[PDB]
Structure formats: C-alpha cells, structure tokens
Amino acid sequence: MIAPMEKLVLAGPKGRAKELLQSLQQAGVVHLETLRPEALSAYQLSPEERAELRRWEAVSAGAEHTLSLLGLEAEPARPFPEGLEAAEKALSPIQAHAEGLTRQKQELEEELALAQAYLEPLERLAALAHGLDKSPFLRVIPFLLTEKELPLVEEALRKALEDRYLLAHEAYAGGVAALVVVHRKEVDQAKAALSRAGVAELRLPGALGELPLSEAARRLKERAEAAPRELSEVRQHLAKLARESASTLQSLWTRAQDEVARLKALEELASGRFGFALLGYVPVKAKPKVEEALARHKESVVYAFEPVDEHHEADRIPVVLDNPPWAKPFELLVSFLNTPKYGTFDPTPVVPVFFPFWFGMIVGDIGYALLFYLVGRWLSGYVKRNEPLVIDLFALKLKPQVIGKLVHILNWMVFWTVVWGVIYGEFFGTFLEHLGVFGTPEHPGLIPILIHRIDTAKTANLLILLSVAFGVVLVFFGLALRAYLGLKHRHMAHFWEGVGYLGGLVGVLALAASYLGNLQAGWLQGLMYLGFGVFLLAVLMSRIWLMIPEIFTQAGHILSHIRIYAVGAAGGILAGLLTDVGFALAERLGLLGVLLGLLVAGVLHLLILLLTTLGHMLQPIRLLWVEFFTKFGFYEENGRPYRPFKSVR
C-alpha cells in the first residue's frame, strides 16, 4: 500500500527560513516543490550566499578530486560543525601535499620510463663517441635501427665519402646503433638521403634529446640510479597521507555535500520582503518526526498539514512502496522497472505470494536446494562480516543491505524448492538409484512419490493443466485488478477494457475446452454466450478500438505459462540423465573407477548448474513482468520518484 503522502506548507522569516530548512534537512523525510506562479517572486537567493555557494562547491570538488587523486573512493561519514576557514585550513595543506607529490612522481615515472628504455644505446654511443663529445666539425647522426640491413641505410654514406665519413653500428643488437659522422652539411644531406631510405635522429624530450650525449648519458645514469628510491619513498608518504588524512577529508566531503545540497534546495522557496513560504510532500508515517522537528522554531511557525488533493491533477505526487516486512525485500526486484502514479495499485505482495512458489516448480532437486543453502549461509556470513561485495570482473560493488535482502529472497525461495524437490521426488537429480528412497512401483524401496516427472504418460497432461491453471488465476486476477483501478478513478475506458478482455478470454477458454476438449457440449455453451456477448457489449459501449487483435495475444499471455513445466522437465531430466550416465557407467563398469565417474558427473552437473540456472531462474520473473504487471497497466507516465532531503551521513 502506497503511503497517502500529505502536503506540508510552511512560512515565516528568512533567517528562520535558513534555520528551519537546516532543521528540516537534518531530519530528511520531506520532498520539495517549486510553488512559483501565485503572488510571490521566484526567490533569487542572495549575492553573498551565491558566492558562499560557489565557494562551497569548489570545496567539495577539490576535496573529492584530492580523494580520487589519493586513490581511495568517496564514502560518507559523520560530519563536523566547524568554521569555514577552519575547513579551508583542513583542506588546503593535504591538497597541496598530494598535488605536489602527484606532479612529482608522475613526471618522475615519465622521466624514468623514457630513461630505462634508452639507457644502454645512449651509453653505447657515448662510449663510441668519446673522441668527439660536441666537437665543432662533424655532427653525429644517431639511429637506433633494426636488424642486419645496414647497407640499405649506408647507401647514403656510400653516396657520401666512401673512404671516409665513419658510419657503422658496433654492438647492442637489440637496436643497431647506426652512427654517421662526416661533417656538418655532408652529414645533413646524407641524413636526408638516409631518411629517404628510412632513418631518424635521436631527438627526444627531457635531457637526452636536448643536450650533448656524454653529459646526457651521465644524467640518465643519475636518474637510473636515483629514481626507484623516490618511487618507494613517495609510495610510503602517500600511504601515510592516506592513513592519516582520508578520515578528515571525507568527513569534510560529507559536510560539503550537505552544505551544497541545502543551499541548492534553498532556491526552491517563494518570498518577497517580510517572509517566505514553501511547500513539500510528507508520507503519513513521518508526521510526528517532522512535527517535533518543526516544534523547535520561533513561535512554532505555522504548518499546514493538508490532506493531499485527489487522483485528479495528480501526477506530480511522489510515490513510495510501504510494504509489510515479510514482503519488504522485493522492492528492488519490482523497482528495476518504473514506479506507479499514487493511485495505481501497489504491485509488490504478489511476487512473494507467487515467484518462489513458481521457482520451486522450476527447480525440483534437493541437491540444488542444499547448494543454494550453502551459498546462502556463505552470503549471510558475508553480511555478518559487513563487507561490501566487490568483483571487478563484473564491476559489481554493492552495499550489504541489498545483500541481506538477497539472503531473505534466497531463503524464502529455497524453502519452496525443497518442498518441490520432495513432491517431484528428485535428490540431486537422481540419487534414488542405489537407495530406493522414492517409491515408484517399478522399484518400490521406500516412501512414495507424488508425480514422477521423468515419464510423460503419467505426468504431462496433469502438469500442463496445472501450469495453464496458474496462468488462468494470474491473468484473471490481473484483469479484475485493472477493472478495480478503472472503477476507482471514475475513468471508464479502463473498466470497459478490463471487463471486455475478461469476457472475451473466458469465452475463448470455454469454447476451447468444449469444442476441442471433451464431450458434454451442453453446459459451457451458455458461458460462450455470456463471454462473447460481454465482449461485443464492451466493444460497442467502448469505441476504444484495436482491442480485437489484442485478445489473441491476451490468450497468448494466459497460455504462455507452459514454460514452468517446460524448463522443469528440461532441467529435471537433464540432471537425471547426467547423473544416470555418470552413476551407471561408473558403477556397472569397473566398480572402482566409480569415483572417476562420480566426480566427472559432479563437475558436469555443476557446469550445467552454472550455465543454465541463470536462465531458468530468470523465466518466472519475466513471466510475472510481461504478463501480470502489464495487464493492469503499470507502464503509464512513469510516476515520480520520492527522494527526500538527503543529509548523506
């Protein structure tokens, strides 16, 4: 049941406006509203508060940027009431430290990466050119080149002085150090011809490709012998900066987010010169908290607890769910989709009354239930450890309250798969073979079975009729509920569409069961009379056309509930056949390679577990999502999501 969501109107003076918006934002259970057009101004806030707002946003952005620079992630904490320039003196030195160190070490890694890849060719050409460092007669064209194609680049030197003009590659065969030395203009033109044959001079950034090679090689030796020490020390100092700055910086981040949220919501008011007024929405189970919070102020400044205006002109109303706590943890599973419109039916209790009971009819293996109970006790130990669940393969990081809801749905699901593993009679596929624990008359060993599910002459017609019968109950409940919601708002087309689909569907079902099912064509024909008469009456008193092609898809939606028995038989006899092959070919072939067949059947059984339990877990909830939720509407105008004053904490 959606909460009735009353209206809250307040007024007063403006210093008290900021103070009561503080006291309303600390107890954050209220939604806001613009309230522009009548008798008040749009409330351009203040110039000095605008400067304070943009400075607070700069504080928040700088703190979060410092934190992401530090490498950790931004979680809230409890804030601290302290002065703004005190927050500046808290923010700026650690920001200066981390910013100077992330300049220093990142440019150090740049210089170290450009150094270590080119130490040895540079030192090699320095030992080769120790008779001419920067002598003013002949430039030294360096080219760290490929393998033994030295004549292809030395053809330019052959075009140059052949009995002179020393150009070769001595050693260091990772890259052949083709050095060329003749003159200034001779080496320039021969370097142009060698670049036409493919060549390039060592002109890099930093100090190597901007200075003479001897002293630059000495500087590269200096950086190679110095830089890992600074690597280790700057990692140590950033670790210390993390461990003794992250708490206070994310605390002031929480404070800054609170201040920015309050000031940006402060413009949602309406005032002139001797007072303001604002409007908001409060759910009805939040009235004593807001009442005692607003009892603090000046002369208990005047509240208007309006009962909200009704379903006409009601699209701007926020929506919540408010379900009893036995059905509570499916709110995320019903809120993957959109939200209702405050006057649409609360859809959430039917998924606890149906979905685990359908998943039991999907999965009828006691071994699957025991493995689910094992992962459930693991996952409840994980919420005992209070760790957020993280996996970077899926980039799935999520908080332990969702994980506790997952514990609840997993337990409330695994009970029904236990009881439908009992009734269907399958232990881990089929381990009734050795110990005949389940009683069929072909090998009666122990307690009987209710339905065998491996053969179809005994099972298929009964199970397929019950699988259609659940869809009959579901779809008739959905169409009756749409007729109810059309009866509520005094909107008549929804009522006619609901009663028309109901009459047409029961008429088609009666005609099917009569003229294609059994004998006794006498009693049901009056029901066919009634059903098609109601359908024609609806189309005549409706004029809401193109329902006539929908009734075929509507029978499709009442009939598409075969898939629960379909994947039930599929997964059931698949598991039974796998354990049958493994158990038989292990036991009756060898009698001591039985552990070989047992563990390979176990690992293939867990393989098909891991490879199709996602699919036949997804099937009942898509059955709900595309039959039942779309019968009674639920896909119109998206509602409006209730977000209160946060106070992020």
Binding site: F336, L337, N338, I464, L516, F552, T553, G556, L559, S560, I562, R622, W625, V626, T630, F634, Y635, N638
Partner: protein
C-alpha cells in the same frame, strides 16, 4: 502403429520448430533495438519489454497445434 503415428509426430515437430524459427527472427531485431533503447537510458524498460515480448504468440500457437496433435492420437 504404422505410418500414421510416425507422420503425425513429424507434422507436430516441424510446426513447433518452424514457428520457433519465426519468433527467433522477430525477437532478434526487436531485441537489438530494445537493448539499444535501454542502453540510452534506464527509462524505456516498460516499453522495451512489451514490444520485445509481443512476438511469442507464434510459439504458443505452435504449442497449441502441437497439443492438438498430441491429443489427436
């Protein structure tokens, strides 16, 4: 049994498989455009699901003809 029981079964199974091929051809392109419209923003979910699962009437019709042929023998 004879040729009767054998040939009604392939008349069943051909109908099921070929109607399944039809709705696979439909849901391929409709699921492509649906995954697109969801990947823009998480707001078109209630319309992508109904436009995606409009073509399953074909395979329930295939199962209808199949169960008629199953009860026929």
């Amino acid at each position: 049994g004879g040729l009767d029981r054998g040939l009604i079964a392939v008349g069943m199974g051909l109908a099921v498989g070929l109607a399944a091929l039809g709705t696979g051809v439909a849901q391929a392109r409709i699921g492509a455009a649906g995954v697109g419209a969801i990947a823009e923003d998480r707001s078109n979910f209630g319309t992508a699901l109904i436009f995606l699962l409009l073509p399953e009437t074909l395979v329930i019709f295939g199962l209808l003809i199949a169960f008629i042929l199953n009860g026929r023998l």
